[PDB]
Amino acid sequence: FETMVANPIKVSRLQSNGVLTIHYSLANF
Amino acid sequence: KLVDFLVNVQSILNAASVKCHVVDESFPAKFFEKNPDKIYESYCKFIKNRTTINKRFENGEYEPIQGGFYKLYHDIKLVCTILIHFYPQGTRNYQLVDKFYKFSSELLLRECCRIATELDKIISYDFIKISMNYTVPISQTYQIRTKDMDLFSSIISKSNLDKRPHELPNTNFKINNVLPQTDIENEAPRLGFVGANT
Amino acid sequence: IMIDAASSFVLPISITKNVDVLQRTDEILWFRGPSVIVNERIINSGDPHLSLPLNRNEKESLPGPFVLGLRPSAKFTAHRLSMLR
Amino acid sequence: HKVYICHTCGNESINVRYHNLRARDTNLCSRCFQEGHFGANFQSSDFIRLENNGNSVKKNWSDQEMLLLLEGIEMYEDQWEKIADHVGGHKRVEDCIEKFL
Amino acid sequence: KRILKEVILAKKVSKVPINNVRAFPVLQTNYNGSIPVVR
Amino acid sequence: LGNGYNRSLLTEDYLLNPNNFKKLIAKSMQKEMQSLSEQHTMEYKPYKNQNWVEYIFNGNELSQNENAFSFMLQPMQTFLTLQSHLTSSLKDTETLLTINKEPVKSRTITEIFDIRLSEGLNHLMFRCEDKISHETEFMNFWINVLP
Ligand SMILES: [Zn+2]
């Protein structure tokens, strides 16, 4: 069990701040 | 003076019991009147051998005396241990009963208050000790040694009234106790430090 | 002095059998230091247990930590629940 | 509606974030702030409880939005798109300038 | 401030209105983070 | 439960601060405290500004499946000392103490060590064992030193 290097969770600062939640603005066919 | 002092606790403990329905849980007579440290072992013996908390006030089971609130404390601790042992340790109705026990025990501890060391050999020789002491319950976290990273866990939400044996999802886990840090808050900086010009 | 270190880790083995009480990602989060338990958030700034006036070896076993934490009295809470409806 | 990735872990904040005032572009969940998982450089004084929910009918300007507007003006000094999203993205450029004046 | 006190001591004027902000500033506990620093 | 696996050795452990740190500064509002979990009272004594905390561990009613403990110390408090009251020094009991890896020998039943810490976390492994009776006990102390 002592040979089980763990996985870092990286935050990536621009993802942490202001990410919103393109065809659904109908101007582009 | 003790007339309204049951009425207000009644109203508060009714209105603060909507989401969990602790007060409307079934509870028979259960005459223990014992040491509150024996309050689970006595009910364990009551399980081995062989009227709810809202209805106790409507029948006038509580008097304006010391026992008239000691019984109320006893009934709350019994119903909370029952609801802790009834659910698993991760459900929301486990943590609601834990929070309700904490809130009601804090509410009932107050308002009845209204109603050997070389360092010590130096300091007790050098100073004068006016003091203050109290009790808090500690909690636990887990412990893992990986390759040179030496991780820690979150706080287990296991209540202080659980009494179960310590299960472990891994035997390569370890367990530790977290001592709470408590003192006069270290002088925080001023608002010129928090929010200067960048 | 860096800021953008990871400081949380996840082990690959799914041990999610007896773990519903810890803090899950949605696995188990494993941090790089312990937690910090804080008794009461609000300091009670007067109270000569803490203020220490300069006038006049004694011990006192106060009931709980709830003396030092600004709790409201129950008569106001019943008054406000009466004002509720 | 945006999403607020909690710093120091990967979690999503539900409806209350804890904004930091010295790195100025991080957030936290409630549980990572109750236990102190935000690194030994910061001191739990410089974390303001901000909300995430959509507020009431416009031209109210709660103190949270005023604070985030002034944080944006101290950040960028221009670039009113990068101000109006930092307010929360539910306000236009043409109203943030009409409120800062 | 003495004089406005004494009338309230003496006369008991019929309203003496109450308008408060219904809050008051208190200090709250601070604590460092527990994750150590990375150099 | 492992509470019936309570400690038979290790009466008292003291993480009291050294007299060097006091002697180099001082030349007091005391607050004792106990934690609701059988024993391990924790006392301290600041004054309006040094603190001189002291962590004691009366292990007569602690468990032994729960060895490790964790607390947080302030950046002026880099030095520490123990006081290790065992039950009885019947045999040549081996008492070693590795902070991270380096064993600490002594100051010279009751044995005193000398501890100097660094920033960040620490391990501070401690254990006692008998030569003849062949029984071991462990203690761990996760000391988070503030930067
Ligand atoms: Zn988080």
Amino acid in the structure at residue C39: N
Which 8-state DSSP code applies to residue F5? G
State the DSSP H helix or E strand holding residue D76, giving kind and residue range, or none if neither: helix D63-76
φ, ψ of residue B88 in degrees (nearest 5): -70, 170
**How does B128-167 read in b/e, with b if 16+ C-beta sit within 10 Å?**
ebebbebebeebbbbbbebeeeebbbbbbebbebeeeeee
Handedness of CA B26, B31, B35, B39 (dihedral sign): negative
Q: Report residue D63 CA to chain centroid gap.
A: 12
Residue D44, Cβ density class (10 Å: 0-12 exposed, 13-18 middle, ≥19 buried): buried
Q: Is E30 an 8 Å CB contact of chain C? A: no
How many Cα atoms within 13 Å fall on the side-chain side of residue C48? 6
* CB of D35 closer than 8 Å to CB of C36: yes
Determine, for residues B141 and C21 on separate chains, whether the beta-carbon distance falls below 8 Å: no
* CB of B62 closer than 8 Å to CB of B69: yes
Give the neighbor-by-neighbor strand order of the sheet with C8-10.
A7-8, C8-10, C30-31
* CB of F60 closer than 8 Å to CB of F7: yes
Q: Where are the beta strands (DSSP E) in chain B?
A: 135-136, 139-143, 174-178
Task: Answer whether F touches B (≥3 Cβ pairs < 8 Å).
Answer: yes
Helices (H), E1-39: 2-10
Residues B61, B74: Cα–Cα separation, whole Å: 13
Long-range contacts (CB closer than 8 Å, 24 or more residues apart) made by D27-34: D27/A16, D27/A17, D31/B154, D31/C23, D32/D6, D32/D8, D34/C38
Determine, for residues B147 and A4 on separate chains, whether the beta-carbon distance falls below 8 Å: yes
Considering only the beta carbons, identify the residue of C1, C35, C43 that sits closest to E26: C43
D96 annotated ligand-binding residue: no
Determine, for residues C32 and E35 on separate chains, whether the beta-carbon distance falls below 8 Å: yes
Q: Where are the beta strands (DSSP E) in B36-146?
A: 135-136, 139-143
Question: How many Å lie between the alpha carbon of E34 and the closest alpha carbon of chain B?
Answer: 11
Q: How many angstroms is it from D26 CA to the middle of ligand 1?
A: 11
Handedness of CA D79, D80, D82, D86 (dihedral sign): positive
Handedness of CA B189, B191, B197, C2 (dihedral sign): positive
Residues F69, B151: Cα–Cα separation, whole Å: 14
Residues F19, F25: Cα–Cα separation, whole Å: 10
Determine, for residues D7 and A21 on separate chains, whether the beta-carbon distance falls below 8 Å: no
Determine, for residues F144 and E34 on separate chains, whether the beta-carbon distance falls below 8 Å: yes
How many Cα atoms within 13 Å fall on the side-chain side of residue D48? 17
Residues E22, E18: Cα–Cα separation, whole Å: 11
Is B109 strand, coil or helix? helix
* CB of A9 closer than 8 Å to CB of D20: no
What is the domain range of residue B20?
Answer: 1-113
Q: Report residue C45 CA to chain centroid gap.
A: 18
Determine, for residues C26 and D23 on separate chains, whether the beta-carbon distance falls below 8 Å: no
Considering only the beta carbons, identify the residue of A4, A9, A13 that sits closest to C8: A9
Interface of F with D in 112-141 (CB under 8 A): 120
Q: How many angstroms is it from F57 CA to the middle of ligand 1?
A: 33
Question: How many Å lie between the alpha carbon of F91 and the closest alpha carbon of chain B?
Answer: 24
- Deposited resolution, Å: 3.4
Residues B174, B168: Cα–Cα separation, whole Å: 9
| DSSP-assigned states of every residue in F50-72 | ----EEEEEGGG--SS--EEEEE
CA dist list (Å): B59 to B56, C78, F9: 5, 22, 54
The DSSP bridge pattern shows strands F125-129 and B139-143 to be: unpaired
The DSSP bridge pattern shows strands C8-10 and A7-8 to be: antiparallel
CB-CB neighbours of F67 under 10 Å = 21
Helix D93-100 crosses helix D63-76 at what angle (to 10 degrees)? 90
Residues D35, B152: Cα–Cα separation, whole Å: 12
Residue of B nearest to D75 (CA): B198
Residues D68, D84: Cα–Cα separation, whole Å: 9
Experimental method: cryo-EM
Listed residue (F133, F53, F123) closest to F87, CA to CA: F133
In the structure encoding, which two tokens stand for residue B27, read together?
Answer: 């509870």
**Which candidate in B11, B84, B160 is best for mutational testing of the C interface (most C CBs within 10 A)?**
B11
Residue F126, Cβ density class (10 Å: 0-12 exposed, 13-18 middle, ≥19 buried): buried
Is A14 strand, coil or helix? helix
- Which residues of chain C does F140 touch, with a Cβ-Cβ cutoff of 8 Å? none
Q: After which residues is chain C broken (C to N over 2.5 A)?
A: 26, 56
Q: What is the largest CA-CA distance in chain C?
A: 64
Residues F27, B125: Cα–Cα separation, whole Å: 14
